[PDB]
Amino acid sequence: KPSPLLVGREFVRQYYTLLNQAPDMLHRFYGKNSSYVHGGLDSNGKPADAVYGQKEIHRKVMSQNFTNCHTKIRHVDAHATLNDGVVVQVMGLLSNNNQALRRFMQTFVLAPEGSVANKFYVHNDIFRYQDEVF
Amino acid sequence: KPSPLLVGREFVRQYYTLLNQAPDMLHRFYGKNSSYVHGGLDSNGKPADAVYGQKEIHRKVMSQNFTNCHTKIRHVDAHATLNDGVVVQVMGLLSNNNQALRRFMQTFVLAPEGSVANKFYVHNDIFRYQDEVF
Amino acid sequence: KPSPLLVGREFVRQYYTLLNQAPDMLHRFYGKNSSYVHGGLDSNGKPADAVYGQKEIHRKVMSQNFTNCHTKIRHVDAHATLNDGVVVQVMGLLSNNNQALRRFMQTFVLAPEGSVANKFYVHNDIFRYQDEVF
Amino acid sequence: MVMEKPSPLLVGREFVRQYYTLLNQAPDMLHRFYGKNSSYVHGGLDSNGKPADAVYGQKEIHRKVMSQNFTNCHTKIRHVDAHATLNDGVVVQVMGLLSNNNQALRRFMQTFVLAPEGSVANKFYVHNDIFRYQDEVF
Amino acid sequence: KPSPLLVGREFVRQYYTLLNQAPDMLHRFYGKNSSYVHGGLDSNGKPADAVYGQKEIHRKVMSQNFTNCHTKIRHVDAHATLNDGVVVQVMGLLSNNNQALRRFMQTFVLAPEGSVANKFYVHNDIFRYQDEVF
Amino acid sequence: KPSPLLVGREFVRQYYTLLNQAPDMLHRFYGKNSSYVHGGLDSNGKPADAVYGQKEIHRKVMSQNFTNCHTKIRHVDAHATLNDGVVVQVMGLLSNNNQALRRFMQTFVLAPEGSVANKFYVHNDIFRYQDEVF
Amino acid sequence: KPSPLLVGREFVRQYYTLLNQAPDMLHRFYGKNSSYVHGGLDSNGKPADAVYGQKEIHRKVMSQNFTNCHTKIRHVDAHATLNDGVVVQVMGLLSNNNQALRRFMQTFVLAPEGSVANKFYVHNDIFRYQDEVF
Amino acid sequence: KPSPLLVGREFVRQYYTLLNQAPDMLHRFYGKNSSYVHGGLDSNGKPADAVYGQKEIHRKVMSQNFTNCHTKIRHVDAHATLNDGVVVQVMGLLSNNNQALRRFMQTFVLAPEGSVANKFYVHNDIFRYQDEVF
Amino acid sequence: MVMEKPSPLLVGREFVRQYYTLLNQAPDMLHRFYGKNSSYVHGGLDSNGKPADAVYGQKEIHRKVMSQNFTNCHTKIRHVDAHATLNDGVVVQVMGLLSNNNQALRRFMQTFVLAPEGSVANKFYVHNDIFRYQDEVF
Amino acid sequence: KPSPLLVGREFVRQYYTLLNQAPDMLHRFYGKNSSYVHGGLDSNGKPADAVYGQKEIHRKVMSQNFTNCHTKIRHVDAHATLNDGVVVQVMGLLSNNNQALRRFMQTFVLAPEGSVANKFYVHNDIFRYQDEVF
Amino acid sequence: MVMEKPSPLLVGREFVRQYYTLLNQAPDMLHRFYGKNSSYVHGGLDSNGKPADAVYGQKEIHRKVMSQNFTNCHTKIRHVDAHATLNDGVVVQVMGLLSNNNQALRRFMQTFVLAPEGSVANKFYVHNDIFRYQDEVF
Amino acid sequence: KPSPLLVGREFVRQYYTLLNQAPDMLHRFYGKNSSYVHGGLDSNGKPADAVYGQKEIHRKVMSQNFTNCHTKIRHVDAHATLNDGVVVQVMGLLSNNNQALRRFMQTFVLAPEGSVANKFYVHNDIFRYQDEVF
Amino acid sequence: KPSPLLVGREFVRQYYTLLNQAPDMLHRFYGKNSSYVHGGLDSNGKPADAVYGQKEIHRKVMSQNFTNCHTKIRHVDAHATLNDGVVVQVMGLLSNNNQALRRFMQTFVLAPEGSVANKFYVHNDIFRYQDEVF
Amino acid sequence: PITFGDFNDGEIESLSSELLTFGDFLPGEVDDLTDSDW
Amino acid sequence: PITFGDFNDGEIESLSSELLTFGDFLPGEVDDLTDSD
Amino acid sequence: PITFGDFNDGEIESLSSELLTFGDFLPGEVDDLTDSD
Amino acid sequence: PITFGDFNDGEIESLSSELLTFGDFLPGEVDDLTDSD
Amino acid sequence: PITFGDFNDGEIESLSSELLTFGDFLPGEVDDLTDSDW
Amino acid sequence: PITFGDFNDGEIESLSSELLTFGDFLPGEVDDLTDSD
């Protein structure tokens, strides 16, 4: 059984590498019933709701139009959870389209796939920009 | 079965009210082999390690010396997760001993007790300030 | 037509239940061109002009930072008023962020919305404490 | 020299001033502030330990303001907040202290709902009057 | 023949008195080919265009929702113009719905109606809030 | 007939370019019986007497002693008026002798010359600073 | 006799405390043929005139409709003047009815009563806001 | 030499008399390197940090506008302390600007000045309210 | 890795935590916090109606705290504010609620004056302890 | 299909005509996700922050306040970029607000609109005052 | 260790550095920067008093580079500004000074358009190169 | 008394030597009544506010942050003036922070300091970048 | 022997002038076995490893490729040290490629050359940005 | 007789010439009782 | 069916669950612990 | 002679006068109306 | 028909109106006076 | 063999492991000519 | 003896040293490389 801390660190490295190297394959990280929210607003001004399902996750990611996003990961904290899952808490800065970096707080929940050993998928993805709620 | 969002909101209300009123009773939220990460810097200016078990969580909470610790819950996200758990991300301001309000993020993973329905315990608690990361 | 007393009691119970539970959706009680004045918040803290509209009311309520806002309603007086509306004067104790009981007086003017029968919205919402004015 | 009609706050402040000055001077004339279907309650207690109910008519109101000696009453208004409401009317929230026949200064909470008379412009009457002492509630 | 300064001062006082008292009768000031713009923004950050004709002027005035507007006329400058017309330059403060006063710049162009002596109508009305363009 | 907006924007460009370059030639814009009100304070302080005719307008313009008058045209409105004339309201910033930019309003009424088509002269010019009114 | 500064400070304390508590008793500070101006705006917009005598001063003070008049005395200057009187200049902030604090200046001329020793009456009271002139 | 109880009572009397009478002269009670921490009041509002030195103490006292501060001393406890100094714990009711009686607790640490016998100065001055804490 | 000496605020917070935990658990051992010339009052009330007086030594403090019979005390510290004072000492201002013998929560007002022991560095003892319930003062 | 040189000359003529005549209409040249960079002062005058989108481009052009922006185009070089777009490098002299000629170099990347044939939009707009970097 | 493929500004800066270092050291090797259908002008001037035309193609782009006698070229870049463009391209704007064969510092204006190679990721080729001396234009 | 031309040439050499080498000691050239105007920067650099006194002049020089200022003095004209002072008008090229040669014109008024013979101080220092006004 | 402050000031001027003008010639300042630490985050935020020798220093400088670096030297301290060398601490602003100015500190240790008098070489150069460590 | 629009002479002034009154009191009646007291 | 704003009947009541307990606390234990004192 | 700071003995007592009256108010009358009610 | 942005053919040229004159200036007099020097 | 999603072992690394190069030069080839000079 | 401000005779000249060289540059190489180029 791998260390949850190293599992979370490796997952964060791979996820934020793929977020800019090829954002259109970010949906491959998620499973059949996975929650995803990436810190957006709307007309009412309230934070955007999450989406569920790989397809809706892919649609939302494509709508988010990530172009060469640079992320500075300032803190990663990974710990054990239900069904040998891993909960990851990420503090960092993300800048999209080479604009100003924005502080962000993120929570990942990765569950084992079940068949392939040492394999995980993103069950939950919660991303929020600090400047949108504070 | 109650809404994940309802469960998260009610838990956040109860937790951050009990933290202000009776910090010594905060250990009853957690169960066996539950993770508690709330802390600041280590002896070498590093984020602290996790604390496991109800007795040790109580010992750590008492160390944090929470004096009239209020709260300013700017945002709460609650999503259903594996094993019927609820993953809550709480972002806001916390002031302890009436000092300046410091921005904070906190990830809760609430597992469902198998005995009683509509019963949860904090399987994971990961608190982290901002001034200490950026 | 429902008795003015009955609609006042209904509204007071529902309004403070929502205030204690989910302050982030208090704006749904109000409609367009509805006025909401709540205490004071300024550089000096005493003058806070009233806000109008659901979106501005939601902004103001988000500023009020209601967290576990407990309320002990000592008295409610509901009377019939123009356009078959009701006027409610409620007196009680309020505690936000787990402070002590502060005596408060609120005046609501509720108006029917026309289409749906026995449906009201908060046209006017005036809040005051006894610490601000002797 | 614009002839701007008064703001709701100015209307409420002026009405509170006139109402309480009249109450101090001529309580019997106070009934002229109310209309046919006006509601009025002024800090009463029934033989139950509960707050009293309200009368719904200038006549019942006159009987109420008459029953209430209201003779030589000193009032100190600490807060007035007025806003616009349904049908051009004005809702006023009054916080103050009152004393009738020179007892102690009792804190009171009041809500006024004034409505335009209609036939005459810039004229209002007290449609609703809710008055409660803090002693009989808290 | 009356003094253009007197005509401008009387028109300004009458126009703002009528705007405060009965804004739904403001269209009676204007004529067949009158132009009316009252300083709005529309979906691009660019000032709103003017409207022409008495009916369109009335519709725009009603849409503008003038509720107990208070004005402080700080400067009026009236001068003669073609066909004995009057051009009026107005500097002032206007507050709608008893909110904060906003600095405004206005230009009126009044023309003789032709048959009745000393009778004028608003051929042109240009109104702009300073905070919307500066 | 050229568009009133085009006429106004072209006249504003020409006028505020000639004001900076050759203010001695500004009098050629006006004709006989033309009002010029550009001014500041006097013994009374608030009103400035208008000067009529090309000679008086040139004398007054030379009196203002324009020196590298820089202009920042924030907004310009041009509408048709009597006798196919154009009424222009110009709002912006003016800086004389490289001093601090001051907010200004200027109302132009351009009357068409009856001899040559596409020809206008400034029948009315009403300039007014803001800092001197508020 | 006491120090002019002592007299001025004591009078300022008593006056601005009685103004908050019992404004109806403020007329007892003045005697006959005593000047009292407290204004800034009227029907014509000119500074308010003066009311002389205890009766007229009381009538004016009552019109001002003082309601919980809070004060913040930034500075008080007290100097001896002719006939052993005291001239006080008071600069500070004044809020009526818990509204926004407005800067104010007030000149008091206190004349000694001939009969009683250590007794003064407000011979002159001149109040002026700042926002109403600048 | 003088009873610590006598010193504490004499201080309390003089200090609160001067607070009620001449707040601008409170800084004379303290010396250099002395500390003056009052109740929470600042731009943020809660974290009112301590200030040191006579001049900074005077600035803080002026900021905290003291106008007719009425104080009812319910209890005073004076005890001997290091360097033959005294410690005074005072409980009472304070009303500033004519608000209501607010429960307050103050802690003075007074040290002998050394040069003049029976002369003390406020080395430490900690003020606290009941409402802003309980 | 710096060996910084604790700030007065940290010293006061840590002392309050230790003091009240010991009072809850082992009140007999509470006397070890005080020195020879230590003054101590804890919410006293003589048979007159006035606050009690102070003991001025370790053994009298010991006897007194046994006299108060602290058994299973629950304390909720709402405010602690510590500052430096003469001779590197720390003055602590404490606001809280206390209950002895499972009684109601009583608001208490407390001032501590801790002084360095002198021999061992970073060691303090309670020179002054002033404690009063607000029920007996207000 | 059209010669890249012909497209470049056409665009340079139209763009620098519209810059001089109607600066507020420049945003129509660009489309979504297009980049405009033109000097500008974040605080020192050197920080050049790119803006994207028609609305942000409009705001940046308005902040520059182009007034009578004259330009003499010394050289234009047009070539064919990817996806059948064009690249234009223009060298010339620019004078805004009637100041002296300043050497400037601009680089446009124009992409075909796609639907309408022979239609282009400014995908990239990099402007540089040569004197700023030399 | 997020890989984080370089931003357009970094790509442009690195390309300018490499391009001008190669031009200084091995101008004959500079032709490898361009593709099959690359456009290239470098401060040309025909015998008409007008700027020279363009060259489209790698082989004769090399011939044009050879024709210009690039020997010991000293270049000082004073401004580089790069941005993203069509087909994940990079448009670079360069302000600088150049001297070939040790004449004076001639001030020059340049525009680069780089496009992905496609076969290999993170690989670019100079699709467009426009270079003009200011004296030959102004 | 020496030749005013010699005094001007000596002062110009010393001043533009000390400006190049040690800008932080430029304030020693001025007295207490000296005036120093140089450039200007409020929002875009247009308002040139003169500063008076050695300390304010040093603040201004330090704000400008002269770093390796190279000066080519094309011309110097020195003349005698009131109270046996000197007036120097210098024309040249200035480059600060290694920018290009910018044409500049400076006017110094030097006054004898009285006590020490043949000693002067810069009473007036008016600097102007020619390009910024032309 | 020159003053250490004089040596430090002259070296700072020459070094930063050469850095702006000809950064490729910066290697001539250093000798053999000289330390160069200028840099930022190498791979994981670690401090940049020092490069020793003229060849490595030149390679590292060319790697940083300062295209046009403008420096605002806020302060320079120069003190004597071992072997008559000079230690300089330079604090200021640095902006590469006309980007935003960033605060920086730089420690130079200049060692004298035993061959030629009044000759120094940069034995140590330690550059550090502020935003990268704070 | 200066008028604007189709408004008659003094129409706007009459439409706007009405003081603030409460109840059935004529304007200035309420204060009269207060003025009766010293 | 007296409802307010845009809330459907019973929406506010559905917004809360009295059967929801966390940890070892019995239902309402936290409310009793905090509201009382 | 217990004094505090740079206060001479009796300075604070001399800082105010208890027989200073304004208008027709008797001594202490203003305090009486404005102390508590 | 080469067009740019959303402008139609001739839309930008329609904003010039070079035959417009103001005052007694002949066409081109203002720009001739200003741009030359 | 720690993998996430359906990505194979090292697929993300392989995809994202490519240095920035220009023209046909191998990475680090261009600076070699500069290193040839002193 | 003509001086300005508060500087002595030749104080400014003493503030500048022409013999101060850094690295391999001859006394004036940096200035020659910077100006007139």
Author numbering:
A (entry chain B), B (entry chain A), C (entry chain H), E (entry chain F), F (entry chain E), G (entry chain T), ...: 5 to 138
D (entry chain G), I (entry chain N), K (entry chain C): 1 to 138
N (entry chain K), R (entry chain I): 472 to 509
O (entry chain L), P (entry chain X), Q (entry chain J), S (entry chain V): 472 to 508
Article excerpt on this structure:
The CHIKV-43–NTF2L complex structure was subsequently determined using the single-particle cryo-EM method to a resolution of approximately 2.7 Å. Totally, three continuous yet distinguishable conformations (referred to as Conformations I, II, and III) of the CHIKV-43–NTF2L complex were identified, accounting for 49.1%, 32.9%, and 18.0% of the total particles, respectively. Conformation I represents an intermediate state between Conformations II and III. Since the overall folds and interaction surfaces of the three conformations are nearly identical, we used Conformation I, which has the highest proportion, to illustrate the details. The final model consists of eight CHIKV-43 peptides and eight NTF2L homodimers. The overall structure of the CHIKV-43–NTF2L complex consists of a double-ring architecture. Each ring contains four NTF2L dimers and four CHIKV-43 peptides, presented in a parallelogram shape. The two parallelograms displayed a rotation angle of approximately 50°. The CHIKV-43 peptide interacts with NTF2L at a molar ratio of 1:2, which is consistent with our ITC result. Four CHIKV-43 peptides can be divided into two groups based on two distinct conformations: chains L and J as well as chains K and I. Chain L (or J) interacting with two NTF2L protomers presents a compact conformation, while chain K (or I) binding to two NTF2Ls forms an extended conformation.
